[PDB]
């Protein structure tokens, strides 16, 4: 089928959409035609709906009218607004994530969450150290616990006047960000101002508008998701080098397959002990299974592949077509990035689609809902449906299309300097040396207006090719996993600078960092690498790119990516069009305000260019000769 | 007017002279954009519209070949409607949050010794309410100690390890538990902002009615919360308001003085102002320019809170705010946030008037922006009234028309100052409802909007319910529907039902009680509140209503949801963008009731609702045992 073959790159992606159209099942891809066209002024952003005087469209036109909504705010202002309620809402997803991992160290703290533990005690107290925590190197564990719980629900409180990682960033950035009314001071508070600020008649001007919405993203990359991911390692261990697989071929005719899909590590983490223990494993075995295969999607499989090596089905566009295996017993789901389409999908096989979050809350779904201090009887109740389930599987409804390709994964931060021997000198020196161009992180999504991964793959081997490092998180996982290029032999496709420097350290030349919470890794290495430098982010040789970006979560990464000196390349324009001011501001006025800018250009290899470009800008600033 | 067009846009002849001189200026109204958008989009308007991602937008239609059914992640239509109901109401929750949020920053500075000009002018309250909340030894301690403490308790109601609102004590027990087992309980102002905006994010709650139920732990948050703290706060920095007398319309302003609107909701800036006005040497400066005096005068809510505290007259509400600048006599627009049309900017541009913004948060593209903060308010608030006073200098006479006589009103009925009236006790007010003098109470507290001929809903409900013998209770955009139909004087018991004219006559308060601004329907909850315990019944068993029946905005609609999740009935002139689905719709008017114990209601006949509020009202009368 050409129109098939036009929806991925990907032969497993390929033979599951053949079987869907055979079953009659309709997909993303189907529905994403259904709604094209798109309505225009949607697109543009030219439309408001926040108070019945409306709803109100803008249009630019020669007679004057509807150039202004009922209340006076004219098209700048307007879809300023909807693009700072857009970030809002990303900064939200990962806001609550953070919360929640507090939530758990603090249960863990108090001796209330059976199961867990802290299996990185040496970082708890290092970050407790670094966050000010009065003798963490050698007061008892729980009690560091309870003050680092403190100090991160302060940042979720509204007298802050800085957030605590904040402290990270040079100087230089900080000191920018304050004249600029920038510093993001509270997870929620900021959000909750963005929201006040874009009620009818108060904040009209577009500039200020904008300006807030890096502010609320910043409170998202140094807040929410930086505080998720520290205290996600502090839980469940810091992530380090290991071998897994990728694609749909990590599920297995001949076992218990259970899916973790969302983000929230303290479900998966509990999920994949529960099928460990001796009683469980029993249970599948007396249903006639080999034994329990949990296998990851999404940010959630992200992480359980960064901590604990196992095998990621696939990534946003692939989870319909993980459930048309017929080999999916169940699916356990937390919140965001869950489409609801799985429910059906679910309900035309054996397929349990299990939720656990009160935020996720899906109807028709078997809701089963975790807390720390219920999640390991919980946890084990799941287990046991999809054992259950296993038992009511159709053998002649099940397909599974490939087989898996090897992936390295597990390159957090303490990773990569331990790789290094310690120290960031060997790193800068390969960039100093121009062994290393610099450093691009990608971190997208999948969109079914883009032939899936196609951007994603083309942009990750043009930049290695150009001796520019990749660093992968989210989707761009599995889509260079499957690629082939998250291994240490993929060297042979960068070009020879990175290829000797990825030779001589054992480590592929993409590196991958986790989930799209552990995009604050990313932040915190241009941090580290820009005050040891003693420049600002916007010096460093970096980048950020997004080539399949969908969700509000990916424009709130970029925005703080943006925000923080990173220039952040887009496959596809936000709903800003509309306005050429804020689109000119997106695109040009940023990097006079905050030292980076953003792209958009949907040609893979175009976008490399202007990466590069930056990138050669950057190295020159640095006054590199090489 | 003789215009048939100006005549359907207002009740009011002062709205029809600016009518009248904006036409013939060449001004664009409010209601002249409101004809441009429409017809309005269809999807927009039922709510069956996306915008959270981009593999969308996506529009929800009812296609014979079945299209279109579902968005592009699979979303149906209440799931879609209920996301947008639910960002809706975190907007209006939203709106009050900031404002609450800078309530305790100032008291705070207070405390510190770090805001001049600002006091602690209630101090009895702030030990009250200290104490009330569970600050030790409120009644004894250094004043500024036991502020420190409150501002603490306040704060970390803006914090994330709370499992209930401070205030939320206020309620019954019997609806505290029920909002618990609900999961309603609001725990955090801003962290129930936060959740609704994960919650809607694609691929998190994908459940109709667990997006309604979050949206109405979301406005309870407001209301017990943001809100509240903003009222309680206010009457501890500025006074508890006490019952006065004052003006309303356009006829306050003067020719002859420097003109001040104040506009948007911030007491902080309002009272600031006002006190800069009455300087000597700033008096004299507008003296020396020509002017009698400075003449300040309120809009929108912080109007609303001006009238309460100082009585100081109100210019208009909503859907006369660009008609004031049309007389020609405002020589300046001090303006913080929410509520306040941009339009205004244009208007002030078309005259001499300034137009000042002085709040981080509330930024005007062209405006005159000097930014207040507590530290500096009363520097920053001289600099403004001088800006006034050079604007005053500029004034064209031949453009003055202000159009009206003021109307004379009652105001200041605070609960505290309703209590006094009674004699401490809420026993006489308790005992007119068991007597059937009063049938019940109902707080009708819209806006306006250009949909709806202004203000001929609430002044005809407002009409309506006292007849019958039903107190009303006035807040926002209401405060001058209701003044200017002469309805808050005490005389205007003569317009009452026999039961409720005694009952006023009895008091010497008007049938309609100003409470406030829009944040003082927290006083509504309070009283309610105190009503429900006095009785050891639920804020649903009580004989009570809410009204908007010119809503616009969606500080109004968490309000609105902030009441019914309280067990209040509430209805709505207009509906929100819900319509495109029904079981969010059937949700909204008639599941809530087997949930919560309230409903909204949907009515754009005034008439009609007052039938539909006075049969709620006789059905709740019947359910405490009432004969009379
Ligand atoms: S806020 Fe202004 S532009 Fe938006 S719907 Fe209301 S009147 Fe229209
Ligand atoms: S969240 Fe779903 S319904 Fe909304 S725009 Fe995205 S794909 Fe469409
Ligand atoms: S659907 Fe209403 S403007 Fe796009
Ligand atoms: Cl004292
Ligand atoms: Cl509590
Ligand atoms: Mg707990
Ligand atoms: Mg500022
Ligand atoms: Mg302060
Ligand atoms: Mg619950």
New interface residues.
């Given amino acids: 089928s050409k129109t098939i073959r036009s929806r991925s790159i990907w032969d497993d992606a390929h033979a599951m959409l053949e079987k869907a159209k055979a079953e009659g099942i309709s997909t993303?891809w189907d529905?994403?035609a259904?709604?094209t066209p798109?309505?225009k002024?949607?697109?543009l952003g030219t439309?408001c709906?926040?108070?019945?005087?409306?709803?109100?469209?803008i249009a630019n036109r020669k007679d004057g009218?509807?150039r202004?909504?009922?209340?006076?705010?004219?098209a700048?202002?307007i879809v300023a607004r909807?693009f700072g309620?857009?970030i809002?809402?990303?900064?939200?997803?990962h806001?609550?994530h953070g919360?929640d991992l507090?939530e758990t160290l603090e249960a863990v703290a108090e001796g209330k969450a059976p199961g867990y533990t802290i299996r990185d005690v040496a970082k708890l107290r290092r970050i407790a150290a670094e966050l000010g925590v009065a003798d963490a190197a050698t007061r008892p564990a729980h009690d560091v616990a309870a003050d680092l719980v403190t100090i991160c629900?302060?940042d979720?409180?509204?007298?802050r006047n800085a957030l605590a990682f904040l402290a990270r960033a040079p100087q230089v950035r900080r000191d920018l960000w304050q004249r600029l009314?920038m510093t993001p001071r509270?997870?929620?508070?900021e959000?909750?101002?963005?929201?006040?600020?874009?009620?009818?008649?108060?904040?009209?001007?577009?500039?200020?508008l904008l300006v807030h919405a890096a502010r609320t993203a910043l409170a998202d990359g140094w807040g929410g998701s930086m505080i998720g991911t520290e205290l996600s390692d502090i839980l469940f261990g810091t992530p380090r080098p290991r071998q897994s697989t990728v694609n749909l071929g990590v599920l297995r005719k001949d076992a218990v397959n259970i899916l973790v899909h969302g983000h929230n590590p303290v479900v998966s983490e509990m999920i994949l002990a529960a099928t460990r223990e001796p009683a469980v494993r029993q249970a599948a075995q007396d249903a006639g299974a080999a034994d329990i295969n949990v296998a990851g999607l999404c940010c959630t499989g992200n992480e359980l592949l960064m901590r604990q090596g196992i095998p990621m089905a696939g990534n946003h566009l692939m989870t319909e077509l993980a459930i048309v295996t017929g080999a999916a017993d169940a699916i356990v789901a937390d919140?965001?990035?869950?489409?609801?389409?799985?429910?059906?999908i679910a309900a035309c096989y054996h397929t349990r689609f299990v939720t656990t979050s009160?935020?996720?809350?899906?109807?028709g779904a078997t809701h089963v809902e975790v807390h720390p201090h219920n999640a390991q009887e919980r946890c084990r109740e799941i287990v046991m449906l999809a054992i259950d389930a296993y038992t009511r599987r159709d053998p002649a409804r099940v397909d599974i299309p490939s087989q898996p390709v090897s992936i390295m994964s597990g390159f957090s931060n303490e990773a990569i300097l331990e790789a290094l021997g310690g120290t960031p000198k060997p790193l800068i020196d390969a960039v100093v040396a121009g062994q290393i161009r610099g450093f691009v992180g990608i971190v997208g999504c999948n969109?079914?207006?883009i032939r899936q991964d196609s951007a994603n793959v083309t942009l990750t081997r043009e930049l290695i090719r150009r001796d520019i490092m990749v660093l992968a998180t989210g989707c761009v996982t599995t889509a260079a996993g499957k690629a082939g290029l998250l291994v240490p032999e993929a060297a042979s496709k960068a070009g020879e600078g990175l290829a000797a420097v990825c030779r001589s350290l054992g480590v592929p030349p993409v590196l991958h960092m986790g989930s799209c919470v552990d995009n604050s890794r990313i932040l915190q290495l241009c941090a580290l690498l820009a005050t040891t430098l003693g420049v600002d982010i916007s010096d460093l040789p970096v980048g950020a790119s997004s080539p399949e970006?969908?969700?509000?979560?990916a424009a709130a990464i970029a925005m703080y990516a943006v925000a923080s000196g990173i220039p952040t390349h887009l496959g596809?324009p936000?709903?800003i069009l509309g306005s050429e001011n804020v689109t000119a501001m997106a695109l040009h006025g940023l990097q006079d305000v905050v030292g980076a800018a953003f792209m958009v250009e949907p040609d893979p290899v175009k976008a490399a260019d202007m990466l590069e470009a930056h990138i050669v800008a950057r190295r020159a600033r640095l006054g590199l000769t090489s």
């Fill in positions: 993303v529905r994403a259904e709604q798109a309505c002024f949607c697109e439309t709906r926040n108070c019945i005087m409306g709803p109100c469209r009218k509807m202004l909504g009922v209340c006076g705010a004219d700048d202002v909807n309620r857009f809002a809402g990303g900064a939200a997803g806001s609550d919360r507090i629900y302060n979720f409180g509204s007298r009314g509270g997870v929620d508070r959000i909750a101002e963005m929201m006040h600020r874009t009620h009818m008649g108060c904040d009209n001007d577009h500039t200020s919140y965001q990035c869950i489409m609801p389409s799985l429910v059906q009160p935020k996720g809350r899906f109807t969109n079914p207006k970006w969908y969700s509000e979560k596809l936000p709903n």
